[PDB]
Amino acid sequence: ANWEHLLSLKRQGDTAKRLRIEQDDTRLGFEVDYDAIIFSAPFRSLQDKTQVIPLSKTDFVHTRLTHSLEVSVVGRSLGRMVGKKLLEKYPHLEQVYGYKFNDFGAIVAAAALAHDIGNPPFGHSGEKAIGEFFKNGYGKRYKDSLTAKEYQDLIKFEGNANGFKVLSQSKPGAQGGLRLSYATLGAFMKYPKESLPHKPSDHIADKKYGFFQSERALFEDVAQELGLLKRSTTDDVSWSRHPLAYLVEAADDICYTIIDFEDGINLGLIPEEYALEYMVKLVGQTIDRNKYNALQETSDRVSYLRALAIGTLINESVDTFMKYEEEILAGTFDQSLIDKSNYQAQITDIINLSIERIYNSREVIEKEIAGYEILSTLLEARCRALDNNDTHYNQLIQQLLAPKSLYENLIQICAEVSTMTDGKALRNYKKIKGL
Amino acid sequence: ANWEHLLSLKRQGDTAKRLRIEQDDTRLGFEVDYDAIIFSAPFRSLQDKTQVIPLSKTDFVHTRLTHSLEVSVVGRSLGRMVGKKLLEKYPHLEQVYGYKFNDFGAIVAAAALAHDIGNPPFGHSGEKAIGEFFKNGYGKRYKDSLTAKEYQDLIKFEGNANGFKVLSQSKPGAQGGLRLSYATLGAFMKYPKESLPHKPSDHIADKKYGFFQSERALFEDVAQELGLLKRSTTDDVSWSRHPLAYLVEAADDICYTIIDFEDGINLGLIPEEYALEYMVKLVGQTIDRNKYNALQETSDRVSYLRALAIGTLINESVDTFMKYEEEILAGTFDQSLIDKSNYQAQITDIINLSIERIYNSREVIEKEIAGYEILSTLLEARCRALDNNDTHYNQLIQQLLAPKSLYENLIQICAEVSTMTDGKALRNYKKIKGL
Numbered sequence: 001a002n003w004e005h006l007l008s009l010k011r012q013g014d015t016a017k018r019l020r021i022e023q024d025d026t027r028l029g030f031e032v033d034y035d036a037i038i039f040s041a042p043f044r045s046l047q048d049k050t051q052v053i054p055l056s057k058t059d060f061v062h063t064r065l066t067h068s069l070e071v072s073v074v075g076r077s078l079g080r081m082v083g084k085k086l087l088e089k090y091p092h093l094e095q096v097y098g099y100k101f102n103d104f105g106a107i108v109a110a111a112a113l114a115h116d117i118g119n120p121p122f123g124h125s126g127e128k129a130i131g132e133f134f135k136n137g138y139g140k141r142y143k144d145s146l147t148a149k150e151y152q153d154l155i156k157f158e159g160n161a162n163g164f165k166v167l168s169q170s171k172p173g174a175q176g177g178l179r180l181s182y183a184t185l186g187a188f189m190k191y192p193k194e195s196l197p198h199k200p201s202d203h204i205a206d207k208k209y210g211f212f213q214s215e216r217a218l219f220e221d222v223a224q225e226l227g228l229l230k231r232s233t234t235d236d237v238s239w240s241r242h243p244l245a246y247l248v249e250a251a252d253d254i255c256y257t258i259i260d261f262e263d264g265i266n267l268g269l270i271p272e273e274y275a276l277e278y279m280v281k282l283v284g285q286t287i288d289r290n291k292y293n294a295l296q297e298t299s300d301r302v303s304y305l306r307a308l309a310i311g312t313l314i315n316e317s318v319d320t321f322m323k324y325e326e327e328i329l330a331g332t333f334d335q336s337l338i339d340k341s342n343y344q345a346q347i348t349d350i351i352n353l354s355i356e357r358i359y360n361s362r363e364v365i366e367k368e369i370a371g372y373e374i375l376s377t378l379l380e381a382r383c384r385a386l387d388n389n390d391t392h393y394n395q396l397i398q399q400l401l402a403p404k405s406l407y408e409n410l411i412q413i414c415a416e417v418s419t420m421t422d423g424k425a426l427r428n429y430k431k432i433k434g435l
Numbered sequence: 436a437n438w439e440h441l442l443s444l445k446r447q448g449d450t451a452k453r454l455r456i457e458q459d460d461t462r463l464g465f466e467v468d469y470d471a472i473i474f475s476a477p478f479r480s481l482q483d484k485t486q487v488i489p490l491s492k493t494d495f496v497h498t499r500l501t502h503s504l505e506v507s508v509v510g511r512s513l514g515r516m517v518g519k520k521l522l523e524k525y526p527h528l529e530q531v532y533g534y535k536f537n538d539f540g541a542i543v544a545a546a547a548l549a550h551d552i553g554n555p556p557f558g559h560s561g562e563k564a565i566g567e568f569f570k571n572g573y574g575k576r577y578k579d580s581l582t583a584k585e586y587q588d589l590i591k592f593e594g595n596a597n598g599f600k601v602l603s604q605s606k607p608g609a610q611g612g613l614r615l616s617y618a619t620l621g622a623f624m625k626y627p628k629e630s631l632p633h634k635p636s637d638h639i640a641d642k643k644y645g646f647f648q649s650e651r652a653l654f655e656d657v658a659q660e661l662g663l664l665k666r667s668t669t670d671d672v673s674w675s676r677h678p679l680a681y682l683v684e685a686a687d688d689i690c691y692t693i694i695d696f697e698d699g700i701n702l703g704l705i706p707e708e709y710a711l712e713y714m715v716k717l718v719g720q721t722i723d724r725n726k727y728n729a730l731q732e733t734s735d736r737v738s739y740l741r742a743l744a745i746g747t748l749i750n751e752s753v754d755t756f757m758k759y760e761e762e763i764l765a766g767t768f769d770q771s772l773i774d775k776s777n778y779q780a781q782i783t784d785i786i787n788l789s790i791e792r793i794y795n796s797r798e799v800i801e802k803e804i805a806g807y808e809i810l811s812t813l814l815e816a817r818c819r820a821l822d823n824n825d826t827h828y829n830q831l832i833q834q835l836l837a838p839k840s841l842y843e844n845l846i847q848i849c850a851e852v853s854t855m856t857d858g859k860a861l862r863n864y865k866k867i868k869g870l
Contacts, residue, residue, distance in 0.1 A: 025515075025519060025536060026512070026515050026516045026519055026536075034508075035508050035512075038504065038505065038508050039505065039508070039738070039741075039742065041495065041734060041735070041738065044495050044497075044501060045495065047495070047497070047498055047500070047501050048495075057858060057859065057862055058859070060476065060479045060480060060482070060483075062479075062482075063482055065482075065500070065501065066479060066482050066500065069473065069504070070473065070474065073470050073473050073474070077461070077470075080460075080461050081461045084460060084461060101460060101461075102537060171731075172729045172730065172731055173726050173727070173728075173729030173730035173731070173735070174726075174730070174735070291608045291609075292608070293608070294607040294608030295607065295608035295609065296606075296607055296608070299476060300476070300606075300608070300609065303474070303476065306474075307474065423492065424492070424493070427492060
């Protein structure tokens with residue numbers, strides 16, 4: 001693989017090449033991508049979408065918009081610091097081609113900012129509820145009308161793949177969706193494979209899939225332009241990750257770990273007494289102990305620890321990337337950046353405490369169970385109206401919820417139900433159930 | 436005034452100079468400021484703070500966090516584009532001192548991101564309720580114990596000044612607050628004056644005031660380092676605006692004008708037809724008519740017009756800034772950048788329509804009326820507990836609401852009441868009232 005092609009500025013449908021040295025510095029394609037996402041209807045909708053973590057009437061807990069924003073800031077830092085080191089290691093990328101360190105920060109920041117844009121509500125539980133609907137619920141009836149991979153897209157419905165659809169889906173008057181740079185689309189794709197085969201290896205990149213059958217042809221074009229290495233020659237396609245996707249993944253991993261811990265403490269789900277114990281190793285080399293002791297409020301002390309731990313893990317992740325840069329370029333790095341961290345024990349301890357006190361908490365379980373019913377009800381309403389669109393009731397449902405092939409209809413129903421805001425989903429659900 | 440001094444990287448308490456050429460490119464002070472605001476407790480709290488604009492059960496309407504985020508993105512573009520032209524006109528800024536165009540984008544983005552951080556709930560009506568409390572309500576009893584300017588800080592309590600307080604307030608373990616770069620604090624100060632005299636002229640910079648008496652000594656430090664020009668001849672202090680403050684203002688004006696209009700259309704408060712009619716001159720040169728006619732959804736057509744109109748006004752504001760750069764540097768520019776717009780008739784039409792259909796709408800008036808009662812109730816409870824801190828009831832109030840001199844206590848009460856999240860304020864209000 002070659003960094004000259006990995007950093008493609010191509011947008012969908014382009015007729016001529018876009019050279020980095022010819023770009024206006026005030027309209028750099030990679031920075032335009034960040035702003036396009038910020039102002040997009042899908043990103044704006046995250047304002048009205050909560051995480052699975054419970055709300056608090058006393059402390060700050062992140063909604064999905066604030067979470068995505070902070071992930072993108074961490075991502076920009078990863079991209080900036082790696083970009084600087086990559087331009088030292090390959091000086092021609094700056095001399096002949098005109099790439100600068102901020103370019104790498106922009107690609108990673110934009111891909112990270114958009115990572116949760118296609119996820120259904122209720123976290124991974126929401127993905128499972130949609131899959132269950134097609135595996136064992138009403139949607140099971142479609143199995144014999146779908147290919148194996150089409151059906152797998154539904155029974156293993158994946159928020160990563162829905163995010164790719166949201167970013168790239170053509171609509172009348174919006175060809176190519178947000179039309180993001182191909183480099184940004186490459187960095188976005190953490191799982192460059194189709195829904196089948198299911199987990200063909202234990203490599204992190206094989207754990208999930210990254211595009212639906214409906215978007216396979218689009219990602220093939222992206223993979224071709226970037227020169228991603230083919231990882232399989234069978235009708236089942238897969239590629240080695242774009243190198244910057246490791247940094248997008250690292251941004252999410254660091255924030256998932258440390259910021260969930262911060263929210264858990266401010267919620268009172270994790271006793272404050274655990275905060276310093278679980279973070280001392282991650283912060284001890286950089287912490288100002290006088291500052292920490294003078295701080296009189298828990299949320300300020302926890303926020304200080306969070307900033308220091310994130311800075312530590314960002315710096316370590318950059319060094320890990322650069323150590324395995326050539327392996328990543330060759331497609332032979334089979335692990336995540338955080339998997340190689342010297343603080344793996346502390347990270348695992350933080351993750352497990354969050355599972356025990358947050359994700360297994362009664363308030364999260366209750367919401368996930370309710371989410372199964374909400375999503376299943378909305379899916380069944382849409383699919384019954386698809387199957388019998390001539391009845392008076394189903395015409396009302398169509399006016400209320402949605403005012404092509406069978407597979408394309410079903411994937412769109414999943415995409416739309418997944419991206420409804422919390423309040424709109426709940427209101428429509430209550431009307432269908434007469435509540 | 437000298438750009439070398441205006442672009443100061445000083446933080447509060449610094450003992451040694453910070454040379455731009457010595458900054459780490461991955462830890463630029465100006466970009467550190469942006470990230471510090473994003474992760475700050477006051478900015479995160481905007482998550483849970485609505486505008487006075489009503490919410491919608493069908494369409495997107497901005498919370499204060501998303502409005503500030505989009506203003507910061509428009510500000511980053513304005514700073515980047517003006518920065519590139521400033522470095523062309525003053526090339527020693529780059530060659531000698533090492534400044535780069537993205538530095539100007541970071542300064543303007545950070546100051547714009549934090550513009551609403553100190554505003555009380557309920558818009559300008561919330562400011563008026565706090566001022567009315569001290570002018571004619573319970574707080575009138577403090578008049579004779581305060582200087583003229585201390586009392587004016589209260590009866591004309593100003594969100595812009597509270598924002599300055601929020602950004603810089605010292606607490607145990609956090610001296611200097613967020614410790615933002617002085618260039619960023621200069622760009623933030625749109626009204627570089629104290630509360631008195633009131634509206635000494637019709638200059639936009641004199642319309643309001645930008646810092647309380649509690650923060651006068653801090654902004655004096657900031658003004659000295661930046662080399663801001665003294666404007667007032669009497670003992671009442673006042674400075675000419677930092678040139679970048681004009682770009683922070685323009686980002687707010689453009690977003691408030693176009694994005695409020697966008698929200699009003701998607702709310703149904705503004706008829707859909709008015710969108711093209713009021714924006715056609717702002718978008719006519721750049722709009723793709725076949726793209727627009729192919730768009731099937733109102734929100735997408737309006738969002739396209741919004742993006743085109745913001746684009747037009749960003750470009751024009753940059754040109755206006757450069758056309759008047761020397762007059763701004765000398766403190767002789769008497770207007771805002773948008774005031775000189777060739778589209779001023781269309782801007783005025785859009786604003787007046789938003790005033791008539793949104794800000795004078797029944798739903799806004801209802802909310803402002805309720806806000807008067809909520810804020811007045813909270814202020815009276817805090818002030819009575821200040822006046823008689825010995826009683827069992829007032830000790831409960833102190834534990835519920837707030838777990839030095841009279842003025843310092845009163846201005847802190849105003850700052851804390853103003854910065855409470857919507858849900859926390861409402862909950863405490865209901866408990867004080869028995870519900």
